[PDB]
């Protein structure tokens, strides 16, 4: 086979939903509006953040409201937040801009 077009962009194509990106300032804790009144998500353990993206998993379960799964080893947005996603799913309306 060809096993390799062409690298000339390297990067994959795909978008995901379930991706948090966590606050810079909270992290030295500077952040005063914290994860409740800040849309980034502010990991209290600070060990499942990756130094490439800055980005924690969000567990789709939990999101629905009920999180029984195996282990879960996600992060678990707030209420406000957890329904910001939510509405992304289910065809809705967007409010106005800031
Ligand atoms: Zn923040
Ligand atoms: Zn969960």
Same mark, same amino acid.
């Given at each position: 086979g060809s096993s390799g077009s062409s690298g000339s962009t390297a990067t994959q194509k795909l978008l995901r939903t379930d991706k948090l990106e966590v606050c810079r300032e909270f992290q030295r804790? =500077?952040?005063?509006?914290?994860?409740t009144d800040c849309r980034f998500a502010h990991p209290?353990?600070?060990?499942?953040?990756?130094?490439?993206? =800055?980005t924690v998993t969000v567990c789709m379960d939990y999101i629905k409201g009920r999180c029984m799964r195996e282990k879960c080893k996600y992060f678990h947005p707030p209420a406000h937040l957890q329904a910001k996603i939510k509405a992304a799913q289910h065809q809705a309306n967007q409010a106005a801009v800031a």
């Open positions: 804790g =500077n952040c005063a509006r914290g994860e209290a353990d600070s060990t499942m953040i990756d130094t490439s993206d =800055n």
